[model samples]
Target: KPLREIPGSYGIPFFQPIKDRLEYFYGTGGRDEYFRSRMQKYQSTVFRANMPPGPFVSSNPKVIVLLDAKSFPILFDVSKVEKKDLFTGTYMPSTKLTGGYRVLSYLDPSEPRHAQLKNLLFFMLKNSSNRVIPQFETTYTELFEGLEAELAKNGKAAFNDVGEQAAFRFLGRAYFNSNPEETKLGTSAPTLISSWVLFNLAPTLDLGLPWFLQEPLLHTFRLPAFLIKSTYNKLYDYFQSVATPVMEQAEKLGVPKDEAVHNILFAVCFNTFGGVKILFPNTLKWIGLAGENLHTQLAEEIRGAIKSYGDGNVTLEAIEQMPLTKSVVYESLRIEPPVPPQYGKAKSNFTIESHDATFEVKKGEMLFGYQPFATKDPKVFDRPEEYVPDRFVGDGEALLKYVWWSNGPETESPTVENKQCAGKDFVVLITRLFVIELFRRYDSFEIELGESPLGAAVTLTFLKRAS
Candidate 1:
């Protein structure tokens, strides 16, 4: 069978790419609304759309936006679609941001150096070992202790602000022994990382991304260093300090120290630090909103796991024992998948078979997989909107692969050769540890969610201890 063209519309007046770009923005008025309308406009599972205004300014005129679960798998199959040029149609970031085309994010699976750099990251994180969860528990425990005091003194404490601090600290201590700093002041603070990193990161409001600005090849947009003078100096110094010991270790493994250091800083900044920073509040927002009932159930599960698996301390094995706790985290991630939009390009002319029909994709054709819709697609999950804690408990394990929030399937292990998040295991474990301590220490709590620059902020009026 010969390859056939995929059916799609740019939602166009059809001419004037700039006009198409503006309409794309109007169509993407909001995340959820955009996806809802996209599926409605096509009235099918898959179609092509001119997306993300800037990229289309030159390189790509349109991208294939996939909406159905069946077609979602095509995005992760690098054999089918090339992932080299992340900025647009190319495979690697040609910018100096990664020190002349370095860093895992820029490199595709096919690149030689990607394997070495990825292994460097794998071992860097592996070196953290079982201490990862314990570290999260200990780090967050101190934070909760402080919060309890704040609640007792001030009647309530903001979880998002505190959560940001906790996430920064946890990433700092766990990733590199040094506490990551924010240098925007006379004195270097004991802990300051998240906000400074966000200054460069901005927001994904195109949903937008800082990467768009950092693309020296295309837009070349960047914030002035003088504007965040403190951050520029201190951030690099901290990276150098943290990178030294890790480089010493990686040097033995025959990896480049300078490159490895950049990857480490980028990994911690772009991946891990931002991850927990967003996820903690996002998950907490849901759990906190679900209220006392969920707190009770989740707490009971952890408490029971403690009695059965531990004397009192929550160990890694103990975490493994609490499947319900894992399920809640899974459900939370499923609801608001961390990585929503995946970008790829066709490696060669190929056939993309959807739920109903097959379509031909030409070589170099751009592909965008909007994961939030696919994860929440009605055909895959029963109650797509509701936060059902036990959805993955018992016989529900089969659906883990459908949880596409982690770049690759949840069930699949992240490898250097692929784009799956290298921090996949780390993210899941810490999130579990987060829920564990919350339930392990508290009986029930009250929370009110507020909007933040990133996401929701949690104001805890009370966090009651367990009897």
Candidate 2:
């Protein structure tokens, strides 16, 4: 089969790169617009474009953009694309941020160390499977109670403030069976992790400044790795103190203890904590926006699911009984994937096809998939822009294959052989639990969404009890 030429260009080197960077960070239409304008210009979802954080940080900003469900999955096929050093897109952070090792997130599936670290993480999750629901229930119980109290006292509750605190504690108890608050890390762990993540990821972040000013600084520069060393070590030491069983398991799996500790810290602080930090509030935003009709439906589904399967207990079996509740969580994930862009390098010459065209991708060319575009591809879903709570119920369940929020298809299970998130299932489980627990306790709660440095600033302005 003959391969068709890709439709667009990287434009003229540094000039175009800087232009794209400016548009990406500060264009009137914003990030989506930058991609949209190009897609519209080329009239192809597959095109040549320069991703953000270009120049000094990313040696080459040129990427083959796959903005559709069909072609985007190529990035997940590890045999066809190299994932090494591309976890955070075009730029790779200093190894010092991960304790002088490239953590599992950055490793390709073919790498031997990748399998070792991945299997250890798999074991870690399986080991904690029993604790997920109860720990989530307990940690979030305090969260909801505190929100209720805060609402009564202050007339509003800062979900972001209290949710961040609960997220660290939940991860600590679920993963290490220890409370981070009681450890030397205490409540400061989240703040330390935030700074450490910012140091590693600042190049990719938008500080909400003017493009000319920000480009020369954020995009053109990398923060010194040494600045984050002490903070990274604080996280490493805390995980080391509480992760004896995990470390032993790592040794049994033939991974070094020190390396395992670093990986665990990265997995918890960056992967798990960061995910929860973005997701919890974002989930609330969508559900809150859906208003009381959806809230009433979720309350009935959650309570009835538990009553039918768990006799009023929110067990795994009970969660399965709640189809609409599960659909709502998947809907939120579909509408706004927490991590939007996924990157990989072509391992060999390959042909990729979008809904409209077949494009030739040369070996070593970078591939970028903006997941929200793929998940919301109009051809794949009806009314892609709107959040329909029952989008995944009944025959709609077939569409789950198109929900590529977890680094792989929603229909696929993550494995050591793919770049899909190792904690994919856990993330879904807990998110569903979040909705289940919230609906179980209150009939409906009101929230105002404000922009925050993280995901969203969700303030609980009102709460209504279930009758």
Candidate 3:
């Protein structure tokens, strides 16, 4: 189809005109328009053809041709399809299309490598025995406390004013191994290069834009330097100047730590919503930044549960007891799932059975596994519109059936074997700790919406939280 013929296509307008289109597409609330427009066009095509409603196509010539032919009948058997084909042929290859920005291949149910990486990452994330969780918690607590102290000296405390820069710093240290000092806001070329590459590439699927667009845009935007140049530099310098001396005062506190901050940053940047968009051009926002905010709420639920049940220590057991916390996480995921609708090409050929009918998806054709649609389906969930915290509580099968964070069901309880997110437990642990700490210190919290924050592209003003 010619570009102009495309439904929402705004044909070759000049740069200034194109900016409006780009802003509409790239801005936070732009996504719903794209999905709505595309889905509307798709629905229009169906109705214009005067087709009767049915689960699977019947009278359509293509369907009739495929289904009627006995010699080469289309099949819809999910088990028959080879998993390897999902990643090798389609998923992995697509990542390179946008210069390695998209990395949620782990969500592909058919890909073994995706599954394996998820398992490995999950294990790293889950094992409380591993020091990362405690380290992260300690680091976060220290940072938060320090920020609070500074705010107190300034005669007011603000979540946005205090935590954001420090949170980014902590995230950088946790993911990339850069000290607060080394990560200069603008002056640090390597950090900026890496950050800019991630920021730019994480949200896009098609890396190679037209040269006219790419060349000039790249030339024009000094994004990392622009975003954090003054604020981050000031924060980093202040952190080092104050935090280092304090650590020296207390010899017991082991400071100057390093984690695989880059890989973690890459994973957080890539696997989570906003980060993944850098690579996948048409990607939607899922759980990363929002997940962190959600985690804060979850932590409070855990703390409340712990206080009610135990000696006020937030342990893994205590966390598990907090159904509200788990539900909040699940609800957040349901509302804003990380990588909600991931695309996979049929490995060979497969059949998916909805309640109404069974549809045969052709091999090599794209299958848009609609995560949010399925999860929020009224048939599957009761009161689908509202957030329910106890949704997955105590039900082993429900947990197994729940495939939001990663694809596939759990093999065992505590589900060490085929558990989706090895880090899920850790996510639970850290998030619970973080939220509890926040509530313990701060009396109340609320969200503040920005004039133009890039929400999930598929939805407007994606959810936000503050305390």
Candidate 4:
């Protein structure tokens, strides 16, 4: 057996995540079956399991799942374990979507050039800092106006569409200083990119669609004029219009141009596009689900912060002043992270210690850590399941790392050398900006959650103005 563990449940080896996937989706919201049932059965904090929740395409075996909060840090301690196989195995990605490049997602922390690629990506994000918040305000204010009108007319508005639209623009403009919507390419990029990513995200295709059927597509620059229309290259090419400058700099920094292009594409389109649709809506759903208690508190904070700054203007500095607002957004992220699975591989034989036990993991073993369970680890938070908006208001910031929803801890920010999310700061900055701007305009909102093209969409029943 490839797995050695401290007395926990893994189910059948070959069919582990295969079994878990059916149980998670088919079961109640996946929390109980994945966390609770196993806790009751195994009576251990650490266990081994498979990951990626798909069939052979991304299904990874020989992984150790950490259920205890105290044991979760080992996953992020890059010094302790090598994330060479961040996929949890020597897995081939859906090359059809990735353009045949082994993007940053595939690179390990130990790779010498990993730092260079991450720096190139970091430059892309940092370039947008000045434009992100103000632009976010514009897009989201428009979204709020539309929703308000919908509520005014129909008394209800689905927020998923609005949220996705806003998220698309912010991520789009932040990455490229231009949203495809603002250009002739239009929502064409959003539509095609989202479709392509979802195709890969799904476990498998119907029938015996071979997992490897996801071949690395030929470079878009090489594809014939006729074949280009139907492929995802259009989205890649559109991204290139804004991204070429970054690629040129990366190449100068000793990174190959092709590698730079592919990784950056992964960051902006593959990761950011569909990711925002899922994440922005999830944030809205939870905040919407949080109801008026949060609405009033946040509105007061945003209003007071603006008045205190006294510039009579919305700025990133002003948004930072609203700690309560930031806390609420961070709290929302803590409960539900957009990208849940964090994985790494053992570069060499490393002995990983849990709260109660230690095990010698062999090199090449796939190690998977589920962020949802880790973030909600009972040992870490007071009421892990319940959404306490002000939970991160003051000293509660200490628990930020436990909020491992975004690849790394909340207290510590993402860096070029680590396995943290490349868009970590970008996500946090814009989300906080959205929260502040949202409160600055609409004082109170009533939102309902329902299923959509994204995981769970939000519906605005009614929005109210401050007194």
Candidate 5:
């Protein structure tokens, strides 16, 4: 069979992207609908489309959209695809926001610095391996106590603010062996890091503004980097003080200490903290919404697993015994991956295939993969739209490779040569521990959902303590 040309069009350039920009933000069904409608119209999972913030800011607004499991993995193939300056899609924010250095997130795997920087990250994670669990449990104990007290006094707990505060402290202590709370920044580090993250990631984030507001302010132009400079500086200062060991190791690895400090700030604040800021709450939202039936199972499984395998402790070994806990976390990740849109450029002319057809892509063309659709592809899962709590249990675990949450497949490990997340295993391990700790303390919990700048706004309105 002959390869089919990718379907759809970039519309009429500047004018057409404006229309897509509007539909992407304000259309009746929003982003998913925009892509879904196009998939239906073209009758193909692969197609030519224009991403937003098109005209002035983005040099090339065009992209070949891949919205299925089979074709999306092409973006991860560094040999075929180039991943430079596409971290925030078509437009990259000013380097001023990152201390005038292109951090690891923005670097291509083929670049020499990329391997050194990525290896440093891998080393950082390994260096901190012993501290992750204890620090997590300690920091989250504080968070849970705070939430319990808030719920008791005010009848509700806003998880984002408190969760973020705990996240900064935990990462600082576990990864850097310093507490943000103990520094001059004190409790201010979370808010400061939030500003830094928002400034760089605003182009990719949706705050649910009306089209008139979203396009011009967010998509058309990037917010100035200077506004976030002072905030990032404070974060930089904190990381500089606490991240000495990591920076020293980088120096030994041929990366400058100052440069490594800056990279550490980006890795911890933007990539690590920013990731948990969203992923943690979204995990709670799904597990909470799953209600008591799932909660009881989780509590029983979590407690029973700990008793049987972990000496009544929620150690990493204990986690292996709780398959349901693992499945729930993977399902939550599949349903709403923290980072949804993966962008890469074709390095050479290539034929990419979806389930039913092959599409020819030209060299140097931008490729966009909206992962939520791919992870939820109906062809790949039963009741694709529904959150099946135990979807990955037993033989279903074979489908784990399709979960592309960590910039790579779930089954794969991050490497210096690939762009998979450095903390890929750490994220899954800590998230699994989060569930284990939650159910260990409480039999079940209920949450009220709302929108947030990061992800789902989850508020705990009810908690049933474990008896």
Candidate 6:
């Protein structure tokens, strides 16, 4: 049966249509029951004018649309999806109603503009200004040390709260490199609370929406439209109330604080704006508003690092020495990759060398490369599910081979250009220091692991380390 034609009668009382569908899916044998019920529901519905009757049995879905990239790529085939050709020509035309948004989806194989934009983004991410390393180190030291101390006092459960705290600390240091005390105390409390709220509510809200509507409405759903809108509004209000004062205080500290604040805010805003673009391909107004406090925290970390180290010189070289900071950032990326399963298109017909199957893919066929699947492949790592700080240590090149942050193993090149992440060295320096300092200063830190998985794109959970 056509999913679009499911009967309105199936919609539950008091529950939104999307929520009703989710409940049904959850109660049944997930996909199998969902498809079976959908088929049944579609057959009973009053057919719309010009609409044909739904199919009696649903065929297995060919692909799962990744909400992050607004494009669908063939998920099961390797030959049908080539990494180099995936992102070639996948953008929709910019439209005003969509807010001037454009996506470099991996679905359009013919377009070069998509590849150009991807290159530009890659350059921006890799550049890592002189300020990034120090900020990362300071933030990492603070957050990690804090967690370690807390774990010593309270045990493993302390990890749940610590993850958010660490995120704030890293962000604070990255953005505000001048003031330490204000940055530390101010950024820590508010950012932690905001993350907690988001952690709790994101799943509930997502669960409430119907699968079809959920994908589209992710960008469009204004708080006032749903029954739980009031609850969501409260979370937003709390975030604003806490984050505003921290920003005001940072502004009073002076220009360095302001500059850091601006960039951190810009990064967050850009992330958020990019997130919504998946639904509205042409939306222009981009704000990466996860939690304003999260931005403030990153700013503070940057400011603190510069002040502590000689005349505020935060360089890439300096950041490499900071291990805790690097770990936090790496873990965050592993936990919540910026864009999950970045899409690509099938440029030509091909076949997976490992699986001897010939799958015919036309020039423009869409194909998705699931990073989560690749990142967690058991063939590459021992106990791939566990998060071990030592996992990337000596002989890390072996582990690095599987990471998708950079292009996978080069196709047998002579020069042997290292496939490691260009920005990874700097990222490591910053994260290690921030986390280390965090553990050093704070005691009785705890991280509460909720029932839900840690990652939004792929399932992951934070690891607890007690000192």
Score residue 123 of candidate 4 by CA lDDT. Answer: 83
lDDT of 5 by residue, 326-397 (tens): 999999999998988899999999888998898888898999999999999888888988889999999889
For candidate 6, lDDT tens digit of each residue in 129-187? 54455555655556456644654566543333444444444443443333323532443
> What are the runs in model 4 whose C-alpha is more than 4 Å off?
1-5, 8-21, 24-32, 52-55, 58-60, 85-90, 204-229, 256-258
**Superposed Cα deviation of residue 185, candidate 4 (Å):** 2.7
* Model 5 quality (TM-score): 0.97
The residue ranges of model 2 lying beyond 4 angstroms of the native Cα positions read 1-3, 453-455
Per-candidate Cα lDDT values, in order, are 0.70, 0.88, 0.38, 0.68, 0.87, 0.35
Error in Å for residue 55 of model 5: 1.4
Displacement of residue 428 (Cα, Å) in model 5 is 0.4
Per-residue lDDT for 1-467 in model 1, tens only? 23346666655443544454444444445545655676777666688776543442244457787877888888889897777756233222234444444567767889877777778888888888756766777778888999989888999888776676677677777776544433332223223354344343322233243433433322323334345545544655667776676788778767767766767777876677667768888888788777688888888889888878877888876777888889999999998876567888889987776667788888988888877778887788998988888889987789997998787789998887688888788889888888888887898888887654465667888778987
**lDDT tens digits, residue span 271-385, model 4:** 7765677777777667777877778888888888888783777776677788887788788788877766666666678776655667777776666666777778776788889
Off by over 4 Å in 1: 1-5, 11-17, 20-29, 53-58, 87-94, 181-230
The sequence of per-residue lDDT tens digits that candidate 2 reaches over residues 1-467 is: 23578877788888888788888877887788988998999888889888878878888999988888789999888889999999899999888778889999999888898989999999999999888888999999988998889889999888886798899999989987888999778788878988999888888898787767776766788888887888877878888989999999999989889999999999998898888889989899999999899999999988988998998688988888999988999999999998898998999987889886678789989999988898888988989999999999999899888888888888998888888899999999999999988998999988997775565788999999876
Model 1, CA-based lDDT? 0.70
TM-score of each: 0.87, 0.97, 0.54, 0.86, 0.97, 0.45
